[PDB]
Design a protein around this ligand. Structure first.
Ligand code: CHL
Ligand code: CHL
Ligand code: CLA
Ligand code: CLA
Ligand code: CLA
Ligand code: CLA
Ligand code: CLA
Ligand SMILES: CCCCCCCCCCCCCCCC(=O)OC[C@H](COP(=O)(O)OC[C@@H](O)CO)OC(=O)CCCCCCCCCCCCCCC
Ligand SMILES: CC1=C[C@H](O)CC(C)(C)[C@H]1/C=C/C(C)=C/C=C/C(C)=C/C=C/C=C(C)/C=C/C=C(C)/C=C/C1=C(C)C[C@H](O)CC1(C)C
Ligand SMILES: CC1=C[C@H](O)CC(C)(C)[C@H]1/C=C/C(C)=C/C=C/C(C)=C/C=C/C=C(C)/C=C/C=C(C)/C=C/C1=C(C)C[C@H](O)CC1(C)C
Ligand SMILES: CC1=C[C@H](O)CC(C)(C)[C@H]1/C=C/C(C)=C/C=C/C(C)=C/C=C/C=C(C)/C=C/C=C(C)/C=C/C1=C(C)C[C@H](O)CC1(C)C
Lengths: 213, 39, 217, 210, 229
């Protein structure tokens, strides 16, 4: 009944449309098992959120680089930041791994044991780490505006918007990597070059995508 | 998927993956630490 | 129930009433070395001895070292104090170690026999009348008599708290000494020197920049 | 959990602080006084630290106040942190040993009365001399209160004592901080700040050294 | 009942009880009760701050036309040092904000004067203290509340416009109004910039990047200059 990825084909039995952004897309049956599907749902949500942040940051920095603001490209921002400011790269790596390890370990053990991080062993906080659903950690900290604890229909609509935007952002990040590997310039530079002449400045004329061209 | 994982859990597949992992670890150790004779 | 990993499955051998009576029980046993109750009791004794020895050693390294930074003392580094002390000494290190081994072996053998049989050191007519005070309390590793002269263990209300302050501190000391060794093999200076060097610039003086702890970077 | 004064009007104070101790305002965000025995010990610790800090602040501020006027005596220009390396009639080591023995005697007597109230009210030498039977730990009385000031409102006076003691403890901490940062005596810092408070603050002085 | 869109259905959580209720919540931020209670105070405080700020900016330009409001924090010299003023403002603002926050989380708990026991605010609602804060109330309370929230929303948009006009043209509100009134067809934002798939032109940031204030080099960048149209 619901729209699927490939029209005419029935959706798989393990995808009944309950999850957000369900289009029956699983030809390899990777998420056929329920626990594996739950783990993959959390993985897809984390991937989409990280890709959304990365895409927004890349677009903003590219916007600042195109106008005379002095911003660097996304493929040179790390070197520019580490060299412009007296910042030690291994120290930053260790700090990020410490913070990410704490947050990810708490999320992991909450996935293994739901609601286990709400006991209060972390500075006395209880309701802020209870977790609403799998991959959707509601509370006053992660959701200070309370958009997940009011107007259930709007919450489901926002869930669909989030998963679709995350998938689009993942595709956008892959496009950024491929565009830099092929053209060698920034994403907005590619967009401007395409807008200047769309019939002759594309992937069919870059000389890398189609080798027989 | 359950049957596929069970097939991957069989003795030849497990032995192949384990020996590939062990061989890769020894090869990488000898690559980053060439010619180790004594401790 | 305090746990070393919120959400992790605490082992069954660490949830029994006998194991829960031990101080500092946080359900930390991933290797399962304490599954056997006899092994758990032996390891508890080993942990208590390690805690007390590490606390004494780390105190003897940190307090004189901290006083040496100021003008209170002039004690050399812990990794060099042995040579300095044996230079202007009355005995070589071998003779001193032999006397130490004999004196330590006597008390360690008595403690071992008490571990094998609790209260067995109170055999009448065996230690010139001092055997009456050599009987430990009801808890292994916590004797009274000559030990604990202030009698702070007679009050039960604080007893459970006191033990919690002894194991935890000891565990911290056990890590401290370990750091004292690693830092010695990574910076070549003393612990107070490493602390001051890190406090001067923590964003650039740490284990990520010593060139030893991160050989791949 | 009553109409007693609070350190945060409206906040939910803990229930173990019911106003029995003097100066109870429900201030315990770290919950250090949850254990009744620990709270009983901390009350005596606060009283002793408060009285010693009061004596210290008085002994730090009075010599500097008398030094700034025409009053003169042998130790006048010496600072409170420089009084240790001063020439006295006896060496510092001898005075330290004498005071350690005397304080050992009085502190063991105080501890004996703390673990057992009324068990140290009797003078060991003169059997006739003794303290009154009605007594509480930390409040000896008797010869320690020859003027009989405790015969009046003991609650209000105890509140005044704990408040002045807390203020003096913070003052001594400030003395240490000011001596470590400015490297000058506290009254000189007060005069410097009173000369122009808009340009002499902790932020300005600490930013000038950054 | 007036609405922000005549003929539309207002949200379920907006029943028209709060003042200034016009059924405007497309994102559903006020669906939660606690969130709405917090946002109501946030809107009231924002409204009052913006009203006072806009009135102050207008009076500042009228009284002192030679002093730019955007530069008011730099070209103002007082015998009281900047750090001293910052400390005074920090302590006073901290005291009043903690009292207001406690009244929000615990209604009817900080209405008593801590210095004088004979002064106490009468019972009221969160965000509307009254008592000594309202010595004169001419007219109905609900009508005046609606007037206050409407004027506050207008002042909030006005302050945002003040900041944007000062960053784009480098002039004050009255100066920008006179400049626009002189040439209305060539002074709007559409006349200053335009974006097309082949070219993107934006107005230059009139505010300098760095400002020297007693040898400290305070950075003063235009708000989101890269995203400017
Ligand atoms: C609460 C007590 C107390 C405090 C805060 C200080 C604080 C100080 N004393 Mg001191 N003292 C105190 C008690 C006593 N002192 C002395 C005898 C001395 C002497 C003889 C000297 C000091 C000095 C000092 C200063 C430097 C400390 C030092 O030498 O550190 C090093 C030691 C450690 C860090 C431990 C100063 C900060 C010195 C001074 O005047 O420096 C300018 C100094 O020469 N004190 C005696 C023995 C009667 C004390 C108590 O009985
Ligand atoms: C709601 C308060 C408030 C607002 C909106 C502004 C806005 C402004 N100030 Mg003030 N100021 C404010 C409060 C105050 N300023 C000053 C002292 C100054 C000085 C000394 C200067 C300004 C300047 C500026 C301008 C540049 C801002 C900038 O890029 O800062 C970037 C820095 C920050 C945003 C602060 C750091 C983060 C913050 C959250 C803490 C701008 C129009 C500058 C100017 O004139 O530019 C033309 C300038 O030189 N302000 C004081 C102390 C009395 C304030 C106290 O409340
Ligand atoms: C104080 C150092 C500093 C400097 C020199 C800059 C400079 C710049 N930023 Mg920026 N920014 C900073 C800090 C700084 N930023 C911080 C700490 C944040 C996190 C809140 C941001 C977040 C930010 C965003 C989201 C954007 C910029 C953008 C820009 C560029 C356009 C002008 C502008 O500032 O718009 C102003 C934007 C703001 C958010 C104002 C905040 C900056 C002030 C000074 C507060 C920082 C004080 C901080 C607590 C210390 C410009 C070159 C824009 C850009 O990338 O161009 C495409 C852009 O969209 N910045
Ligand atoms: C039982 C017989 C035997 C023994 C004792 C050795 C011993 C050794 N061989 Mg050899 N070898 C053998 C048979 C044997 N080989 C056979 C039959 C062949 C033909 C396939 C080879 C072919 C061969 C080659 C081509 C090379 C060696 C090398 C070595 C040395 C490598 C040490 C090392 O791996 O680093 C250290 C390994 C570790 C640190 C792994 C530790 C395991 C974990 C990670 C740590 C746990 C420890 C606590 C070592 C002394 C290498 C060499 O350099 O010679 C000197 C090398 O080039 N061997
Ligand atoms: C099990 C813990 C331990 C161990 C193995 C050592 C080992 C050592 N210490 Mg040390 N010490 C310790 C704890 C320890 N200490 C503690 C807890 C403190 C107090 C913070 C000290 C304070 C200290 C100082 C100040 C000095 C040493 C010194 C030394 C070295 C010379 C040996 C010696 O002192 O002659 C043998 C000592 C005795 C036989 C005891 C003599 C009785 C003492 C002086 C009175 C204390 C009474 C008490 C009941 C015992 C030696 C390597 C000295 C050094 O560095 O050498 C250059 C030195 O200056 N230690
Ligand atoms: C328990 C608190 C306390 C402590 C530890 C000290 C400690 C000290 N005081 Mg002090 N003092 C105190 C309270 C205290 N005072 C109070 C409350 C007052 C106000 C009455 C004074 C007024 C005072 C003066 C005027 C002087 C000292 C001085 C001294 C120093 C030498 C004292 C001496 O010569 O022997 C004891 C003296 C007698 C028994 C007589 C010494 C470090 C002297 C100094 O500054 O050192 C150079 C000195 O001139 N004190
Ligand atoms: C009895 C508390 C007390 C008092 C009255 C003072 C007073 C003073 N301090 Mg000080 N200070 C204190 C505690 C105190 N301090 C403590 C606990 C510390 C941490 C160790 C410091 C650390 C400190 C530094 C580093 C400096 C001062 C400095 C100063 C002087 C001026 C600038 C200033 O006020 O900085 C700010 C003071 C504070 C931030 C302390 C916090 C406020 C305390 C807790 C009092 C609480 C207020 C309370 C309602 C009582 C009001 C006063 C009352 C007697 C009427 C000034 C005369 C400066 C100086 O020496 O001038 C040259 C200086 O640089 N103080
Ligand atoms: C500083 C000490 C903080 C402190 O102890 O405050 C005192 C207060 C302690 O309240 P209680 O422990 O009595 O909590 C019981 C109830 O009264 C809660 O209100 O803490 C809070 O106000 C909670 C709000 C967090 C305050 C956040 C700090 C500022 C946020 C910056 C962004
Ligand atoms: C479903 C399925 C199943 C069936 O059965 C089969 C198949 C078909 C196979 C499938 C499919 C799959 C897929 C498609 C996948 C993909 C994914 C992705 C793309 C991801 C990304 C993902 C992505 C991501 C996360 C990303 C992120 C990003 C980021 C962070 C960034 C960052 C940054 C920035 C800002 C800038 C600077 O300067 C630099 C950096 C640092 C660089
Ligand atoms: C629990 C568990 C179980 C699970 O299942 C698994 C696992 C993970 C394996 C685990 C863990 C473990 C661990 C961590 C361990 C460690 C230990 C230690 C560190 C010890 C030390 C320990 C340590 C110690 C005793 C130490 C001691 C020290 C000393 C005496 C010192 C001495 C000295 C001094 C004074 C000075 C001089 O000049 C020098 C000297 C002569 C040098
Ligand atoms: C409480 C009380 C009570 C008692 O009993 C009495 C008393 C004392 C009287 C009191 C007080 C009161 C108050 C404070 C008031 C105030 C108000 C305000 C300020 C308003 C404003 C309000 C304000 C507002 C709306 C504003 C508006 C504005 C605007 C639109 C602007 C516009 C513009 C712009 C953009 C720019 C350009 O270039 C110019 C223009 C075009 C011009």
């Amino acid at each position: 009944v619901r729209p699927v990825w490939f029209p005419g084909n029935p959706p798989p039995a393990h995808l009944d449309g309950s999850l957000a952004g369900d289009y029956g897309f699983d030809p390899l049956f990777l998420g056929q098992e329920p626990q594996t599907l739950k783990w993959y749902v959390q993985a897809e949500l984390v991937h989409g959120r990280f890709a959304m942040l990365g895409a927004a940051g890349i677009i903003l920095t590219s916007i600042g680089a195109k106008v005379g603001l002095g911003f660097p490209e996304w493929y040179d921002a790390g070197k520019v930041v580490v060299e412009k400011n007296n910042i030690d790269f291994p120290t930053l790596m260790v700090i990020q791994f410490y913070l990410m390890g704490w947050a990810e370990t708490k999320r992991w053990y909450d996935f293994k044991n739901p609601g286990s991080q709400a006991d209060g062993s972390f500075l006395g906080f209880t309701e802020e780490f209870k977790g609403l659903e799998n991959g959707y950690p509601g509370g006053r900290f992660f959701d200070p505006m309370g958009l997940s604890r009011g107007d259930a229909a709007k919450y489901q609509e926002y869930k669909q918007k989030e998963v679709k935007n995350g998938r689009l952002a993942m595709i956008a990040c892959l496009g950024f990597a491929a565009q830099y590997a092929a053209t060698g310039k920034g994403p907005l530079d590619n967009l401007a070059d395409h807008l200047a002449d769309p019939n002759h400045v594309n992937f069919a004329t870059n000389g890398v995508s189609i080798p027989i061209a | 998927m359950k049957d596929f994982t069970t097939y991957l859990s069989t003795a030849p597949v497990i032995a192949t993956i384990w020996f590939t992992f062990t061989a890769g670890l020894l090869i990488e150790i000898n690559r980053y630490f060439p010619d180790p004779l004594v401790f | 129930r305090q746990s070393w990993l919120p959400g992790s499955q605490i082992p069954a051998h660490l949830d029994t009433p006998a194991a829960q009576a031990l101080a500092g029980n946080f359900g930390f046993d991933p290797l399962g070395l304490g599954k056997d109750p006899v092994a758990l009791r032996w390891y508890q004794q080993a942990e208590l001895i390690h805690c007390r020895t590490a606390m004494a050693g780390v105190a003897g390294i940190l307090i004189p070292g901290l006083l040496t930074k100021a003008g209170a003392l002039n004690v050399p580094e812990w990794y060099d104090a042995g040579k300095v002390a044996i230079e202007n000494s009355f005995a070589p290190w071998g003779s001193l170690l032999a006397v130490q081994l004999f004196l330590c072996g006597f008390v360690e053998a008595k403690r071992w026999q008490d571990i094998r049989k609790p209260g067995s050191q109170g055999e009448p007519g065996s230690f010139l009348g001092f055997e009456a005070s050599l009987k430990g309390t009801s808890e292994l590793g916590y004797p009274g008599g000559p030990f604990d002269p202030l009698g702070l263990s007679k009050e039960a209300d604080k007893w459970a708290d006191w033990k919690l302050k002894e194991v935890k501190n000891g565990r911290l000391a056990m890590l401290a000494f370990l750091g004292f060794v690693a830092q010695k093999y990574a910076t070549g200076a003393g612990p107070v020197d490493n602390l001051a060097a890190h406090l001067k610039d923590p964003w650039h003086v740490n284990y990520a920049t010593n060139g030893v702890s991160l050989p791949f970077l | 959990d009553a109409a007693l004064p609070s350190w945060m009007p409206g906040a939910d104070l803990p229930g173990y602080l019911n106003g029995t101790l003097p100066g109870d305002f429900g201030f315990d965000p770290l919950y250090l006084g949850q254990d009744p025995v620990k709270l009983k010990w901390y009350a005596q610790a606060e009283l002793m630290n408060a009285r010693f800090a009061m004596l210290a602040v008085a002994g730090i501020l009075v010599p500097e106040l008398l030094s700034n006027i025409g009053f003169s005596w042998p130790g006048a220009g010496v600072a409170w942190y420089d009084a240790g390396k001063f020439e006295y009639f006896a060496p510092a080591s001898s005075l330290f040993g004498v005071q350690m023995l005397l304080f050992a005697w009085v502190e063991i007597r105080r501890y004996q009365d703390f673990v057992k109230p009324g068990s140290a009210n009797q003078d060991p030498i003169f059997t006739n001399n003794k303290l009154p039977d009605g007594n509480e730990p930390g409040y000896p009385g008797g010869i320690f209160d020859p003027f009989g000031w405790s015969k009046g409102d003991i609650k209000s006076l105890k509140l005044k004592e704990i408040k002045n003691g807390r203020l003096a403890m913070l003052a001594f901490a400030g003395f240490i901080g000011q001596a470590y940062t400015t490297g000058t005596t506290p009254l000189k810092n007060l005069s410097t700040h009173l000369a122009d408070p808009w340009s002499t603050t902790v932020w300005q002085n600490d930013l000038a050294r950054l | 009942r007036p609405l922000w869109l005549p003929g539309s259905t207002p949200p379920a959580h907006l029943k028209g009880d709060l003042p200034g209720d016009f059924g405007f919540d497309p994102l559903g931020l006020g669906a939660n009760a606690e969130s709405l209670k917090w946002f109501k105070e946030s809107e009231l405080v924002h409204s009052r701050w913006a009203m006072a700020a806009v009135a102050g900016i207008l009076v500042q330009e009228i009284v002192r036309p030679d002093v730019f409001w955007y530069n008011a924090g730099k070209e103002v010299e007082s015998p009281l040092g900047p750090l001293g003023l910052l400390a005074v403002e920090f302590f006073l603002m901290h005291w009043v904000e903690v009292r207001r926050w406690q009244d929000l989380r615990k209604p009817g708990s900080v209405d008593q004067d801590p210095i004088f026991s004979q002064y106490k605010l009468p019972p009221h609602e969160v965000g509307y203290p009254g008592g000594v804060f309202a010595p004169f109330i001419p007219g109905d309370l609900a009508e005046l509340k609606v007037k206050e929230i409407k004027n506050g929303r207008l002042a909030m948009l006005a302050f945002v416009g003040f900041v944007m006009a000062a960053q784009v043209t480098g002039k004050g509100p009255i100066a920008a109004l006179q400049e626009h009134l002189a040439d209305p067809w060539g002074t709007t934002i559409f006349s200053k910039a335009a974006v097309v798939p082949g070219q993107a032109v934006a107005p230059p940031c009139k505010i300098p990047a760095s400002v020297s204030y007693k040898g400290i080099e305070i950075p003063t960048p235009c708000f989101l200059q890269g995203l400017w149209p």
